[PDB]
Write an enzyme that holds these catalytic residues in place. Structure first.
Site, PDB file in Angstrom:
ATOM      1  N   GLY A  95       0.868  -1.159   0.000  1.00 46.08           N
ATOM      2  CA  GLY A  95       0.000   0.000   0.000  1.00 46.08           C
ATOM      3  C   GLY A  95       0.913   1.219   0.000  1.00 46.08           C
ATOM      4  CD  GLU A 143       0.360   2.213  -3.981  1.00 45.50           C
ATOM      5  OE1 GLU A 143       0.255   3.452  -4.141  1.00 45.50           O
ATOM      6  OE2 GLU A 143      -0.538   1.517  -3.465  1.00 45.50           O
ATOM      7  CE1 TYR A 144       2.197   1.986  -8.487  1.00 41.02           C
ATOM      8  CE2 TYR A 144       2.935   4.027  -7.461  1.00 41.02           C
ATOM      9  CZ  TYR A 144       1.923   3.244  -7.976  1.00 41.02           C
ATOM     10  OH  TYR A 144       0.634   3.718  -7.989  1.00 41.02           O
TER      11      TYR A 144
END
Ligand SMILES: O=C1NCC(=O)N2CCC[C@@H]12
Length: 497
Positions: A95, A143-144
């Site tokens: 996340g 991410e990422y």
């Protein structure tokens, strides 16, 4: 006729787990019991989130998590499979909070994939966690990863695929194999970090869920739709970061695949993925938001669209001024910049001065508050019609959304998505996709089919000539061409078959 995937994120902060309850909203706003049987049947996947990668470089829960509590929440989730035998409870690792470049655990992600040992150790922890808590698959949301970390990321995924496939056999899960997915960038800028190796990244995956939203934000000077399906020429445009990726292509190749500036839309991201060889549409999943982004300080004339604004881009919200009138949840979350569809729906019927407008190019709604100078870009059952038809027409794998607690109590957004894909009495054959701007780039993965006279060894061609050779149609970039396509860089591959 393969059922379209419907992937919904179930996010619950640690403090809500440690105090889980299904009888008191003040504490757990969206308990698992809110996912009624009806809702469990309209979903194919629920991404439980989030887990992280600790300093020990293995998959793991948040340290402060009370394990007994977690397992119970999770068991309430897997218990839902009793209502729908195709339902899979995945668990997501990462996340934005944990994994962004400046995130708390960012280093763990970088190191976890650094070597065969760390990779095997990481992979093995992912499968152990899956089996231990009873999940049905692994979803990784880093991410990422950046260019140099890509090979490791890729090798890690292959490793996870290997173990999972072995586990499916050991567990006799042929009918509902364990799966592996990742949340993928939904905008060229972050996409350019690994774009050149999409094929390898997507190979070990069942799906790549594109975060085709947040394409606008307060970090952007001009207000815009955060998830426009198609482009609006009157809207802002952006630098096509993909033309700077390490593709090793020619000026002509880059330019044709990556026009710039361009419209940052859901269509652009999907087409950008389809432009690469080895990236099957069936594995592409379109992400959609169940929330809207609010801006303040906009000026009239375009209903708040494409206007300068005075919204703070920092995180956490660098203020205590909750200016999104009517948005109660914004107060609960101390941020007037984000509002769930649920809350938005209430604000609309509440006479707070908001006017719902529709942009027929982007095929998305937005709110304008003329009195206070507010603008909200969000999605709804109507924008979802176009997005669903696009998913069917483009033969994509399905749809993903963030997140379940943002749908209204009746679960209308989820039901709308399910309806558009599965209701026998729903007919979108006449739904007009409009004239919004389409992403016209052409790459190795989406070359049009053409026909051309076979190349003749020893023949001299003028400029703009077309020929067939080695399965492709080629065109000359200039005159007096005396060599063959592939051996003479004066030829541009422009078609296939
Ligand atoms: O980190 C997140 N932020 C919000 C969102 O849309 N997500 C998709 C999966 C990752 C998650």
């Amino acid at each position: 006729s393969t059922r379209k995937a419907v992937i919904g994120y179930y996010f619950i902060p640690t403090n809500q787990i440690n105090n889980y309850t299904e009888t008191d909203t003040s504490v757990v706003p969206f308990p698992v019991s809110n996912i009624t049987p009806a809702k469990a049947k309209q979903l194919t996947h629920i991404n439980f989130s989030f887990l992280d990668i600790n300093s020990n470089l293995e998959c793991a829960w948040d340290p402060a998590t009370n394990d007994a509590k977690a397992r119970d929440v999770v068991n309430r989730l897997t218990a839902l499979k009793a209502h729908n035998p195709s339902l899979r409870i995945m668990f997501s690792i990462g996340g934005w909070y944990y994994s962004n470049d400046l995130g708390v655990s960012h280093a763990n992600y970088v190191n976890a994939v650094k070597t065969p040992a760390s990779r095997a150790k990481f992979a093995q922890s992912c499968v152990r966690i899956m089996k231990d808590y009873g999940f049905d698959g692994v979803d990784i949301d880093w991410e990422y990863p950046q260019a140099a970390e890509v090979d490791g990321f890729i090798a890690a995924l292959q490793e996870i695929r290997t173990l999972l496939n072995q586990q499916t056999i050991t567990d006799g899960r042929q009918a509902l194999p364990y799966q592996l997915t990742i949340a993928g960038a939904g905008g060229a800028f972050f996409l350019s970090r690994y774009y050149s190796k999409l094929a390898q990244i997507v190979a070990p995956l069942d799906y790549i869920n594109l975060m085709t939203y947040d394409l606008a934000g307060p970090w952007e000077k001009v207000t815009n739709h955060q998830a426009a399906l198609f482009g609006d020429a009157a809207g802002p445009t952006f630098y096509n970061a993909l033309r700077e990726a390490n593709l090793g292509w020619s000026w002509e190749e880059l330019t044709r695949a990556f026009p710039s500036p361009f419209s940052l839309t859901v269509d652009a991201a999907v087409q950008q993925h389809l432009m690469m060889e080895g990236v099957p549409s069936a594995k592409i999943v379109m992400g959609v938001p169940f929330y809207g982004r609010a801006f303040k300080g906009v000026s009239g004339g375009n209903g708040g669209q494409y206007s300068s604004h005075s919204t703070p881009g920092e995180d956490p919200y660098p203020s205590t001024d909750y200016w999104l009138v009517g948005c109660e949840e914004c107060v609960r979350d101390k941020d007037p910049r984000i509002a769930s569809y649920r809350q938005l729906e209430q604000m609309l019927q509440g006479n707070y001065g908001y006017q719902r407008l529709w942009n027929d190019k982007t095929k998305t709604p937005y709110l304008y508050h003329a009195q206070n100078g507010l603008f909200v870009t969000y999605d709804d059952a109507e924008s979802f019609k176009y997005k669903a038809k696009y998913i069917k027409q483009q033969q994509l794998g399905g749809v993903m959304f963030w997140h379940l607690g943002q749908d209204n109590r009746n679960g209308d957004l989820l039901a709308a998505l399910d309806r558009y894909f599965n209701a026998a009495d729903y007919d979108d054959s006449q739904l007009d996709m409009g004239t919004g701007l389409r992403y016209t780039g052409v790459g190795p993965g989406n070359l049009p089919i053409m026909t051309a006279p076979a190349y003749v060894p020893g023949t001299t061609y003028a400029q703009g000539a077309l020929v067939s050779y080695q399965g492709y149609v080629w065109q000359t970039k200039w005159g007096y061409i005396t060599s063959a396509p592939g051996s003479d860089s004066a030829w541009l591959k422009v078609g296939r078959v």
